[PDB]
Amino acid sequence: GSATLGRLVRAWPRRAAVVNKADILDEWADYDTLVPDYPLEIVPFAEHPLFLAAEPHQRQRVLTGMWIGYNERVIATEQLIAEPAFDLVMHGVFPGSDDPLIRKSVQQAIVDESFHTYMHMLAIDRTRELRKISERPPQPELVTYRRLRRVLADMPEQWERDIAVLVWGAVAETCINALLALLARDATIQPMHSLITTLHLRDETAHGSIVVEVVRELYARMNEQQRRALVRCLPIALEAFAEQDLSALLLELNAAGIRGAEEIVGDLRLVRDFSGARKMVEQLGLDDAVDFDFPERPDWS
Amino acid sequence: GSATLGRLVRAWPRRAAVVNKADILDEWADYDTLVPDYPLEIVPFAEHPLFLAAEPHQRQRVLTGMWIGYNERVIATEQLIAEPAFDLVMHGVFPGSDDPLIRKSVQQAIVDESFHTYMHMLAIDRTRELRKISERPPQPELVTYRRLRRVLADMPEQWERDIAVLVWGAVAETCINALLALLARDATIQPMHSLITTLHLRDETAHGSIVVEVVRELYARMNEQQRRALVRCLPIALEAFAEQDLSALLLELNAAGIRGAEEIVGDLRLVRDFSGARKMVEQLGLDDAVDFDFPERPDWS
């Protein structure tokens, strides 16, 4: 099979977050409240005069709410979008998906996503306890998921449903959230927050390459109509993931009690790294077939 | 909160198979064909004259097929029975399930089961390759899963379906396969086969305790009609897992080409350790209310 796939599979034990930092709970050991939860630097409205007009404790509440929000959306994306695409591959619904190397690589990724959910849930649970947050609004359905659920609405054919689920998961795993890399590299925020994002980024870097490899091999074995449908839904999913939703922002701002939240969000760079998906598209021989305009590779990538 | 739960959560990092034997795939490194896959000592028809009349290679195909059969049923059990009950706990439908300690303990078990699946899949893949087994049906739908789908098909009400899932999952995680314990301690079979089962047994012992605490905690928060539904389906589930099924062994004997297989099967202990579910029943205070005769806990327990 793919030598690259072979490598990623053999490398998993020494790379994986679950193997090498199972004791993440312990990282809250000697917590210090005075370190912030989220970097002000990457807050798009950090210097909006209405944000500066607020109380220092309101600004901190916003920083904290954005961190928690970030975590909630990571868990939702994984559970609703990424894992179901991995689960379909393991279920053998695609020809060539019975290959023992494809199955090994994907099942390893499933173990990782299980651990990612665990780390992010612990992040939320520990932040809430330690910052004394009794009840915040969890509320909004992921926007990416809403868009996916609309695609599937008028789609009776199971084989076509499966292509869509596979594509949405592939995009999700090959387009890296800006906040993942930015939080990973930040030395000003809580050490466990930068740790968790660092561990997650290390696994996700691997998942991106696995997906490029797996999708190429599956596209190769798909019938003509599966192939066309894959190329069809690619730009849709890609546009869904390129989209920025300010709606999350408004809610946090309003929650921390900041006056003129609507003007801040109105008056208002966190672009995903699409490089993995560019690589995926190219490996399909579709570097002329997909109606999507790839954002130029981000500086942190 | 439950002290036991607190315990198992803190111990998970040093206990979990995924942390301590993630490089299980390397374990095929010095493979020796001469060592059997399965212990003749625990094969029920090992001393049957018709099985003794077979050619040596045919006895070996049977031993190997039973090992593969075992692994296939483990994966099916984890994916169709156990995981869906853990997944229901995490998605919040039961009152009290929002508790952070229950969430930590169950998400840890989810990570474990992902890895159990990985280990068993590898076991099959490596066996098929090395024993040069190219064609084989996975064939029969799980008997316990068939029984489950039967019970579910006549439930129009989602809340009732939820109880059955939970309970079926609960019984699966508290009633230990004899094969799991018998293979773990066997010094005569391939060392990876006894390794895989030993690692899975370590994790499964903790899962049974977790499930006892979680179930008790969730039963307490349930409404009256949920209480009743849990109590009613417990003996139904216990019976499925107590049920001996001979159908798979028949296929193995036929696949191997053993003459008089039917008569060997018709002529035909592998009882689970129900001690875990015994403790669960007593933790619910339900000793008088469930109609099930627990077997005397096995020597290996």
Swiss-Prot record, chains A, B:
Top-rank taxon, per record: Bacteria
Effect in UniProt of substituting D112A: Loss of activity
GO MF annotation list: identical protein binding; metal ion binding; oxidoreductase activity
Result of altering E173A: Loss of activity
Effect of substituting R73A: Loss of activity
Cofactor needs: Fe(2+)
EC number(s) on file: 1.14.99.68
UniProt entry tagged with the keyword Metal-binding: yes
Phenotype when changing T77L: Retains 14% of activity
Keywords of the record: Iron, Manganese, Metal-binding, Oxidoreductase
Main function: Involved in the biosynthesis of the polyketide antibiotic aureothin. Catalyzes the oxidation of p-aminobenzoate (pABA) to p-nitrobenzoate (pNBA), an unusual polyketide synthase starter unit. Reaction mechanism involves the generation of a peroxodiiron(III/III) intermediate, which effects the initial oxidation of p-aminobenzoate to p-hydroxylaminobenzoate (Ar-NHOH). Ar-NHOH is then probably directly converted to the fully oxidized p-nitrobenzoate via a four-electron N-oxidation, bypassing the formation of a nitroso compound.
Oligomer status and interactors: Homodimer.
Family membership noted in the UniProt record: Belongs to the AurF N-oxygenase family.
Protein name, entry field: 4-aminobenzoate N-oxygenase
Record organism: Streptomyces thioluteus
